Amino acid sequence: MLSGLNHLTLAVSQLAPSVAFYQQLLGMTLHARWDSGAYLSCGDLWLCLSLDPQRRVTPPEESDYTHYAFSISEADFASFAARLEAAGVAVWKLNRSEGASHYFLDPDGHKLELHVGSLAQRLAACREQPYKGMVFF
Amino acid sequence: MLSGLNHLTLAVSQLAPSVAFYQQLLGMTLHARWDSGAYLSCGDLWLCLSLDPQRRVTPPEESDYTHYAFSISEADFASFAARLEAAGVAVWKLNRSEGASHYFLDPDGHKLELHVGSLAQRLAACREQPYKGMVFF
Ligand SMILES: [Mn+2]
Ligand SMILES: [Mn+2]
């Protein structure tokens, strides 16, 4: 039986800017680094950055909607979004759904998000206003 | 401050086969589905499957090393991996370069992994058998 997400691994084209992004800009804890990768944590999340010559710096119009959302409190959301904006981090989408969300790109074009709100909160909102074709289990 | 992964969203090309893969084959909990997506959980993980016409079925030699690992216990690991193999689930990696792991593909070629062990356990193993150039903080 699967018990949760064990780790998220992102392929990166250049290790130093990716470590700077996740550790320094985004505030994650750097636990180890080696010639071809790094391990960081963000709360319970184990993040691995893996240096990969196959990684393309990918414009957001050229990748699909796969994305990785990090939790932040409502109280901290606006100042963190402003930090990303000050650093010139690109936005790939505007929020149109329940709960605050800020949609931003990493140095290689990985699609990231800051989101406020749980699955339970989303399901409660959906029960009141179901999406087209929505069924609950 | 960021506090962990709020959710993982995977773009999928065909919603029903992807829901079946995560729910039926991998045993995740299906909470809701609608015409364009589904919400599942795997322990604390919120997984969203999002129907995306841009998603392509991607062979593993065409994608980078970005991947998503799910936790499984030492007692359950081998029989779950063997069940996926017997069900014909495609693979993408054989060499265990980061401990006890099984590497497999979802229907669209998303790179998945079963892994036994925490970040702390992997750091302890790496102290004895470090990756080239490894430094611990
Ligand atoms: Mn999202
Ligand atoms: Mn892995």
Side-chain angles (χ1 to χ4, degrees):
Chain A
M1 173 180 51
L2 305 180
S3 60
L5 188 75
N6 188 265
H7 61 268
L8 169 62
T9 297
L10 302 180
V12 302
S13 66
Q14 302 182 229
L15 189 56
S18 295
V19 171
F21 185 89
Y22 288 100
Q23 181 196 26
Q24 298 292 332
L25 191 62
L26 271 57
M28 297 186 189
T29 301
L30 178 63
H31 295 278
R33 180 177 174 164
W34 58 101
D35 290 352
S36 66
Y39 288 150
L40 302 95
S41 65
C42 180
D44 285 316
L45 177 65
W46 171 7
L47 178 61
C48 172
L49 305 179
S50 184
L51 181 61
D52 187 353
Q54 194 164 6
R55 177 66 199 184
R56 192 162 72 95
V57 177
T58 301
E61 301 86 350
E62 298 179 20
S63 62
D64 63 50
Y65 191 59
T66 299
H67 69 267
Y68 320 116
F70 306 109
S71 292
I72 189 163
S73 74
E74 184 176 17
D76 294 344
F77 177 89
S79 58
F80 207 106
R83 177 182 182 83
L84 297 173
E85 286 297 330
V89 177
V91 166
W92 61 275
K93 181 177 165 74
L94 299 187
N95 187 26
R96 299 182 175 82
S97 285
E98 76 81 30
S101 287
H102 182 82
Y103 294 99
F104 64 108
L105 297 170
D106 102 336
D108 283 304
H110 291 285
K111 284 171 172 164
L112 309 178
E113 176 187 352
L114 307 178
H115 182 60
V116 183
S118 68
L119 173 57
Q121 181 181 298
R122 176 61 56 93
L123 290 168
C126 289
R127 288 199 192 81
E128 296 292 20
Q129 186 168 114
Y131 304 155
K132 176 182 145 273
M134 192 158 201
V135 180
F136 297 89
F137 305 90
Chain B
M1 154 191 212
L2 305 183
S3 59
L5 194 77
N6 186 272
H7 60 270
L8 174 59
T9 295
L10 303 179
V12 303
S13 66
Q14 308 190 12
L15 185 56
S18 296
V19 172
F21 185 88
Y22 291 94
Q23 186 270 294
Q24 299 172 354
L25 190 71
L26 297 187
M28 297 185 184
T29 301
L30 179 62
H31 297 277
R33 71 182 180 68
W34 64 104
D35 286 352
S36 293
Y39 295 142
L40 300 97
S41 63
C42 180
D44 199 45
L45 175 68
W46 176 8
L47 176 63
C48 172
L49 304 180
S50 182
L51 180 59
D52 186 352
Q54 296 196 330
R55 179 64 203 189
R56 308 300 171 214
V57 179
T58 304
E61 306 88 355
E62 282 294 325
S63 62
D64 62 48
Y65 198 61
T66 301
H67 70 266
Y68 318 115
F70 305 111
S71 294
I72 191 165
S73 71
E74 173 149 343
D76 294 342
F77 171 77
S79 65
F80 199 117
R83 182 176 58 81
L84 298 178
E85 289 281 292
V89 176
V91 302
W92 60 278
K93 169 186 169 64
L94 283 171
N95 169 265
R96 297 203 182 165
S97 48
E98 55 177 357
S101 292
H102 179 73
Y103 297 98
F104 65 105
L105 296 169
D106 99 339
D108 284 304
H110 291 288
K111 284 174 174 164
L112 309 181
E113 173 188 348
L114 309 178
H115 181 74
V116 181
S118 67
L119 172 57
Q121 293 171 302
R122 186 91 298 256
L123 291 165
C126 286
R127 283 186 182 272
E128 302 325 281
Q129 309 198 345
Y131 318 138
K132 187 85 195 274
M134 196 159 191
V135 173
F136 299 84
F137 300 101

